[PDB]
Design a protein around this ligand. Sequence first.
Ligand SMILES: *[C@@H]1O[C@H](CO)[C@@H](O[C@@H]2O[C@H](CO)[C@@H](O)[C@H](O)[C@H]2NC(C)=O)[C@H](O)[C@H]1NC(C)=O
Ligand SMILES: *[C@@H]1O[C@H](CO)[C@@H](O[C@@H]2O[C@H](CO)[C@@H](O)[C@H](O)[C@H]2NC(C)=O)[C@H](O)[C@H]1NC(C)=O
Ligand SMILES: *[C@@H]1O[C@H](CO)[C@@H](O[C@@H]2O[C@H](CO)[C@@H](O)[C@H](O)[C@H]2NC(C)=O)[C@H](O)[C@H]1NC(C)=O
Ligand SMILES: *[C@@H]1O[C@H](CO)[C@@H](O)[C@H](O)[C@H]1NC(C)=O
Ligand SMILES: *[C@@H]1O[C@H](CO)[C@@H](O)[C@H](O)[C@H]1NC(C)=O
Ligand SMILES: *[C@@H]1O[C@H](CO)[C@@H](O)[C@H](O)[C@H]1NC(C)=O
Ligand SMILES: *[C@@H]1O[C@H](CO)[C@@H](O)[C@H](O)[C@H]1NC(C)=O
Ligand SMILES: *[C@@H]1O[C@H](CO)[C@@H](O)[C@H](O)[C@H]1NC(C)=O
Ligand SMILES: *[C@@H]1O[C@H](CO)[C@@H](O)[C@H](O)[C@H]1NC(C)=O
Ligand SMILES: *[C@@H]1O[C@H](CO)[C@@H](O)[C@H](O)[C@H]1NC(C)=O
Ligand SMILES: *[C@@H]1O[C@H](CO)[C@@H](O)[C@H](O)[C@H]1NC(C)=O
Ligand SMILES: *[C@@H]1O[C@H](CO)[C@@H](O)[C@H](O)[C@H]1NC(C)=O
Ligand SMILES: *[C@@H]1O[C@H](CO)[C@@H](O)[C@H](O)[C@H]1NC(C)=O
Ligand SMILES: *[C@@H]1O[C@H](CO)[C@@H](O)[C@H](O)[C@H]1NC(C)=O
Ligand SMILES: *[C@@H]1O[C@H](CO)[C@@H](O)[C@H](O)[C@H]1NC(C)=O
Ligand SMILES: [Cl-]
Ligand SMILES: [Cl-]
Ligand SMILES: [Cl-]
Ligand SMILES: [Cl-]
Ligand SMILES: [Cl-]
Ligand SMILES: [Cl-]
Lengths: 171, 171, 171, 11, 11, 11, 322, 322, 322
Amino acid sequence: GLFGAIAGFIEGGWTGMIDGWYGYHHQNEQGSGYAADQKSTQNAINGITNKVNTVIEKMNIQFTAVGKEFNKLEKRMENLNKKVDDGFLDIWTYNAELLVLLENERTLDFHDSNVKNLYEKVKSQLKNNAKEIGNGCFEFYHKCDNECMESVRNGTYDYPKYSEESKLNRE
Amino acid sequence: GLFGAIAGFIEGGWTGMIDGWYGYHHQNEQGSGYAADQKSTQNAINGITNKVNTVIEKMNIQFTAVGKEFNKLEKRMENLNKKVDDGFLDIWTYNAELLVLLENERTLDFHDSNVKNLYEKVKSQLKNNAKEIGNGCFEFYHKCDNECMESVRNGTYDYPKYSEESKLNRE
Amino acid sequence: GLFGAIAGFIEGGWTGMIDGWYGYHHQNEQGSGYAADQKSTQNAINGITNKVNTVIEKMNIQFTAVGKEFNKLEKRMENLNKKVDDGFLDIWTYNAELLVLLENERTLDFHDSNVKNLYEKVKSQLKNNAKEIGNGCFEFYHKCDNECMESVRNGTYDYPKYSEESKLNRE
Amino acid sequence: XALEYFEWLSX
Amino acid sequence: XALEYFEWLSX
Amino acid sequence: XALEYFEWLSX
Amino acid sequence: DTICIGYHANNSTDTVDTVLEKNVTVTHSVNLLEDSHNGKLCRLKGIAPLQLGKCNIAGWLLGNPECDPLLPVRSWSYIVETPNSENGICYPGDFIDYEELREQLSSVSSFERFEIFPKESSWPNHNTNGVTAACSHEGKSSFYRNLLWLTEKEGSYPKLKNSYVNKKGKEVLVLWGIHHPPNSKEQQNLYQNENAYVSVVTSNYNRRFTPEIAERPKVRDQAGRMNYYWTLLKPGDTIIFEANGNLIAPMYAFALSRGFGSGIITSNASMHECNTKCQTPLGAINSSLPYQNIHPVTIGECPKYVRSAKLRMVTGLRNIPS
Amino acid sequence: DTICIGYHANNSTDTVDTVLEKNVTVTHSVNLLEDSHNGKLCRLKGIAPLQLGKCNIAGWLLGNPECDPLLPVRSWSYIVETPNSENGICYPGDFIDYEELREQLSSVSSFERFEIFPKESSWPNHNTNGVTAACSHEGKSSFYRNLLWLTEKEGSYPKLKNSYVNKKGKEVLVLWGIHHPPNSKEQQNLYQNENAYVSVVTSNYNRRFTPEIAERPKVRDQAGRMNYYWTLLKPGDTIIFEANGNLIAPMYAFALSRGFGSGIITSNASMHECNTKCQTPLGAINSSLPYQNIHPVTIGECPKYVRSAKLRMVTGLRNIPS
Amino acid sequence: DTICIGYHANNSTDTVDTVLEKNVTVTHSVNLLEDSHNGKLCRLKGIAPLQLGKCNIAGWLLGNPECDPLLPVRSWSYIVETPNSENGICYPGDFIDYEELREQLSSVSSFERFEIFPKESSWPNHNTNGVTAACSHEGKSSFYRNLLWLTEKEGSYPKLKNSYVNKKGKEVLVLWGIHHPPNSKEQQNLYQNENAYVSVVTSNYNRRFTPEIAERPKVRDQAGRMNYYWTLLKPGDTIIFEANGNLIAPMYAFALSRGFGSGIITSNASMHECNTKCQTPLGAINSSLPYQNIHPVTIGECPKYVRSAKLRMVTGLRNIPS
Ligand SMILES: *[C@@H]1O[C@H](CO)[C@@H](O[C@@H]2O[C@H](CO)[C@@H](O)[C@H](O)[C@H]2NC(C)=O)[C@H](O)[C@H]1NC(C)=O
Ligand SMILES: *[C@@H]1O[C@H](CO)[C@@H](O[C@@H]2O[C@H](CO)[C@@H](O)[C@H](O)[C@H]2NC(C)=O)[C@H](O)[C@H]1NC(C)=O
Ligand SMILES: *[C@@H]1O[C@H](CO)[C@@H](O[C@@H]2O[C@H](CO)[C@@H](O)[C@H](O)[C@H]2NC(C)=O)[C@H](O)[C@H]1NC(C)=O
Ligand SMILES: *[C@@H]1O[C@H](CO)[C@@H](O)[C@H](O)[C@H]1NC(C)=O
Ligand SMILES: *[C@@H]1O[C@H](CO)[C@@H](O)[C@H](O)[C@H]1NC(C)=O
Ligand SMILES: *[C@@H]1O[C@H](CO)[C@@H](O)[C@H](O)[C@H]1NC(C)=O
Ligand SMILES: *[C@@H]1O[C@H](CO)[C@@H](O)[C@H](O)[C@H]1NC(C)=O
Ligand SMILES: *[C@@H]1O[C@H](CO)[C@@H](O)[C@H](O)[C@H]1NC(C)=O
Ligand SMILES: *[C@@H]1O[C@H](CO)[C@@H](O)[C@H](O)[C@H]1NC(C)=O
Ligand SMILES: *[C@@H]1O[C@H](CO)[C@@H](O)[C@H](O)[C@H]1NC(C)=O
Ligand SMILES: *[C@@H]1O[C@H](CO)[C@@H](O)[C@H](O)[C@H]1NC(C)=O
Ligand SMILES: *[C@@H]1O[C@H](CO)[C@@H](O)[C@H](O)[C@H]1NC(C)=O
Ligand SMILES: *[C@@H]1O[C@H](CO)[C@@H](O)[C@H](O)[C@H]1NC(C)=O
Ligand SMILES: *[C@@H]1O[C@H](CO)[C@@H](O)[C@H](O)[C@H]1NC(C)=O
Ligand SMILES: *[C@@H]1O[C@H](CO)[C@@H](O)[C@H](O)[C@H]1NC(C)=O
Ligand SMILES: [Cl-]
Ligand SMILES: [Cl-]
Ligand SMILES: [Cl-]
Ligand SMILES: [Cl-]
Ligand SMILES: [Cl-]
Ligand SMILES: [Cl-]
């Protein structure tokens, strides 16, 4: 990946997370579980929807196009017509295949970027209150209940609230 | 943003900074103020100038192109000519719109990348001498005058010069 | 660079490293030396090979295409044929040049991304056991022999093995 | 086109 | 084309 | 096309 | 206590190609290429096509006897010829500007077959019973249903001059023929004149025809020829025929209506009770996809034809359940 | 003490579209699509166009009386016809290879109208006073200014044979006509011959014409026709006319100069005192932008025509003053 | 103890252009544009081309005496004309449908020149010794090798009627001519008939020719003309000639074979002992690159022609040995 998250420092994907493209997995005393991030997922959905719809939109509706006939003394006009049809066909095949390839690369890079940015968001919310244990995971230096986890997910993590306890455990 | 800086961890833009695309805002005992980064701005200007000029350059000057006439017994040639004009028109409209879209996406991503890299430059110059208080801001653990700020901006920040004081305040 | 590594915080390249696109340079008591990273280099080679081969593949083999002749009373057909040849020529020249430019930009960005990700891999393997001295270099807080360096390179760096010593030296 | 891949998407 | 968006740009 | 730029590449 | 950041994965086996890497398994994707058709000839926007079946354009317009007679008034969305078209020009000769005529019919949406020159009472003092074995119907000798072979009656061929005024309010396609006997003997036996001529004129059409007598190789056991001519009579305009021999006079002409989106195709499929917005010679396409690799010849509102075998766009992520 | 990293923002309301997101407000942008014209016909690189005004190419070249007579020598950058073109071929007939002639004139930069066959003293023993009401000028009956209706004089029409040698050093466009009377009576009354013929020959041109007599529907109250023919006489070459009837002899020919970048357009705008490098039928375009959505028909050095309504490229940043 | 992360650098001076920055020095690159050719005419897939040398298609097919006679049977991959082509139509006249004929020859892979109408014993009671100074060979007066000038013998020109049945199993190109004398005196002196006619017919071809007598400007010191006609005789079909004057009868016809990938080019290069898969008028291209800026005219399997001066794709890194 261009951003090194997908198939990078986050090696694999989660089949357990069925309700979104990007999200979280938590484990505390109350238990463990998955939870998709709706904001980033919705944004990505919107963007990619716009991408597909624009690709479709740019290709106009092919109206009626049929062949024509020429007598034995019109070989030049025949070959000219054929050259036109063939040239247009070549160009359009080319454009379609190329566009698909490019947008595919860009799409995968886009998802990679989203995951990376999500990880960085969480990493910036937490600080010395947690440590990076790799594989896109954080280990808290304090007890983090479901409410705390929720605060992490919806972007309202109270750092000074656990700063003292985390400071004590970090030593 | 693909790099998560613009409209990302740096939420908004600065109307107060009128002399550049990317730059700094400082506040010390001597006062506060904005200051655009001329290096990165100039580089971006050069790149984008090159982009626009190349888009314009690739489209050659359309010389004289007028219609032609056909009698009542030349309907095939007429429809062929029309098919040529229409096909070329379709292809060129397609190319123009698509190219504009692609380069626009790439341009916004480019600016995002520039801001991100600037932030990382500053973050790498400073170290434990300052802390990340979010929103793309750094809070010094020492007194940083206009000369110090300038050293940060033009890439000559003296880390050991303030390392002791910052070490004392950080405790 | 879009990722700020190449010609960024890693200012220059290594002529001393002849056996790969990306790699390492080490220096310990046993001596100093270069060592290319074969994994990332091989991946990049594969990707770019695929890029070149696809560009070549998309352009089909131009079969026989020769001019045609017209008498003094077929000026319209002549100019039509000429308009076809010219239009196709314009479009193909355009497509070729544009595709080359785009893929070139994307290629340089790709290499930049690879170097950046390699650096981040090493930075994530090491932690407080080493410090970032800039220019894409790490200085160990412990003695790192050739075996240790090798563990860093092939991704099996034993952090707790040197964690104590590094903790002592870091103080 | 709509991508209804999740139930809570807004379409 | 030139982008004279700032006064100190070099054009 | 192959890019034989290094000896240990696999072609 | 831990929290982790991750991404979606499923059991999808969809694969897409990128510039850096072919054949990437992804969680969600979208096919843009239409490769499916029903293999049927259908209605186009509610309008049924004009099937000529056993005959082609020439045979249909001239009025070839072997063709099953169509209804007096017909309306269609497109015209269908079969590769098995055997019945066309039954009496050997050249169809002048036939391709142009086809191109004209390509934008025609309907026709009305009417009597422009009524048989009994149009060509007095002339025989109208001439037939041939080249245009054989049910074993016996016959002739075109829209044309009429004028022959000498009672030893004479008086200079005939008839006309028609178009008050149909639309274009009237008029077809006729010129006979070229293999020898002068037959020329005298049929038209009683060696210096015969035909003259067809309108407000914008003007042509004169002179019989060319020469022995020619047998085609359908006929050493003589018969050239076919046509013209489009404008609304309110008059067409005049004047001949003293060798004229295959018109009997049935066509009141034509102009339309859009029509065309002529060669197809093998048969007509079914279905409706579509896109039709190919191989079958109908019911799709909203931008591309199709089924057939270059399309009628209606269709996807763009490309040679591509696969056009799949990734929407989801790189699928890594590992 | 703090320091912050940020980016530019302003009050710009410019919007651009991207692949992921439409309608993005940005700080700086650049319009690539030209949508503005002046609605005037101007000079092209200092050269004024050739306006035919009330007439078309046919009427101008033939010398239609209703047209305001142009100066003997003219030079232009492009030719302008009006949709209000009523005056063209005034006497009914066919203009042979008229489209090809237009295409030839499309690369012509100037003409010199000169007397190739002087009226009084060219066609001795023949009448040159023939006029018609179909070509009416100021109520009275007239004829083409460049052509001459040769008629029988004193009961006879001697076989005339005249020639012209091109020493103009350039191509000389020569136009003539062939008359086709509605009846043989008028044929004898005008040319006194029933087996008349016309012969026009050069070094590379060769054609013979035979009068076709037949009654035709009235067009501009004329039952007779008049076919118009033309040819380009090479420098140093000779053109020969030989007729014993039905010849509408040339009187004024055209010395033509070849140029580049010219063309024929149909326009409604009028000529003003301005200059441009790009001209459309709707008006002139003064721009350096690569694209334009004004008109597909362009003359000079113009932007590429596209159907697009908007082509705006972002140069600045995503504008977020919030 | 330290460890560093870095990237490759070398002494490469290759430069590539990007969208953001032109002229970037890179470590590794790949040229996609072919600009090199050998400046030679070579074999195409083992098959040698058909060089006409001093003559063009017209001169070769008609049988111009000045041309060095080719072998009876020839096979080629493409046809080469020279800009120095002086020898073509030696006797002034028009070559009817010559361009179409060239287009037909463009898909021909081989010919067999054979006697269709043997000289001595084909046209009894007629002279076959007619020559001219316009077709001068070695100073003396001659004529086309494939055609035959039939003239009056012993004061009479009997109505000749000959035929040929194609049993070659392939298309047989047949060429002939029609003479148009400058005056009636020469007409009588050559063909003894003032109402002469020529008739050429097959199963699908049918044309009649009538001599047009008129004085014409001297071309190659000849005031008379000679129109050239041709047709393709289908396998198993018969061609019939019937004339009582002015017929330039066929003597040698061509058995043609159809092929693919052939074409006609104008070249200055000479034939060498080499082989290629791609040929241009400037020389042969031995390459696997997708693009070439050498010449738009190509034969065989060639790269796509573009106007580009440089198409270099970067594979390696930004080269910074600093
Ligand atoms: C975001 O999450 C925080 C944490 O879950 C939410 O705050 C808690 O909000 C609930 C309301 O259901 C309060 O009753 C809890 O007491 C809050 N916890 C704390 C720390 O007091 C917050 O409501 C959520 N919403 C947003 C938009 O931030
Ligand atoms: C970059 O900024 C540093 C800090 O402002 C500049 O250095 C100071 O430079 C001035 C010259 O105007 C000296 O007189 C000050 O004493 C310097 N401060 C220190 C730390 O001594 C430096 O000149 C600037 N220029 C560059 C290119 O680095
Ligand atoms: C990766 O590198 C590590 C370190 O060099 C390798 O491990 C050492 O492996 C060798 C085998 O040659 C052992 O004998 C050494 O004792 C190991 N060092 C340690 C820390 O015990 C390892 O073999 C390499 N291979 C892989 C795939 O990890
Ligand atoms: C694969 O996943 C799909 C959901 O996309 C589900 O409908 C199907 O049952 C699954 N099949 C298998 C074999 O897992
Ligand atoms: C494509 O990937 C699929 C999924 O693993 C694999 O089965 C197949 O072998 C691959 N095909 C090629 C040719 O790479
Ligand atoms: C239709 O035509 C194809 C040839 O294009 C032939 O293979 C097929 O047998 C035909 N089928 C029918 C039903 O006529
Ligand atoms: C065409 O296919 C779509 C997709 O199922 C369906 O909704 C529609 O009913 C079909 N139309 C017809 C007329 O079959
Ligand atoms: C908007 O900003 C522009 C500078 O780009 C300035 O000229 C103009 O006065 C401003 N208008 C408003 C209403 O702020
Ligand atoms: C586009 O964005 C502008 C700026 O906010 C907004 O006024 C407008 O409603 C938007 N239009 C659409 C259709 O998104
Ligand atoms: C020009 O022509 C247009 C039709 O294309 C018509 O609407 C308009 O009235 C005309 N204007 C003038 C000034 O002639
Ligand atoms: C065309 O427009 C440009 C832009 O203002 C201007 O510089 C130039 O003077 C204009 N030219 C004419 C002839 O009006
Ligand atoms: C440049 O490097 C190449 C290897 O790519 C080598 O063959 C050549 O000798 C070098 N030349 C110089 C002058 O360094
Ligand atoms: C391109 O870069 C090369 C390498 O430094 C330099 O020699 C040359 O001057 C540059 N050319 C241009 C026009 O930028
Ligand atoms: C080939 O032709 C070119 C003109 O296209 C001329 O410059 C050159 O002299 C010629 N060379 C030879 C060898 O004939
Ligand atoms: C064409 O060039 C390639 C590249 O060197 C070479 O391998 C090949 O032998 C050449 N072919 C001929 C026939 O010269
Ligand atoms: Cl969770
Ligand atoms: Cl500042
Ligand atoms: Cl190393
Ligand atoms: Cl019906
Ligand atoms: Cl003037
Ligand atoms: Cl051979």
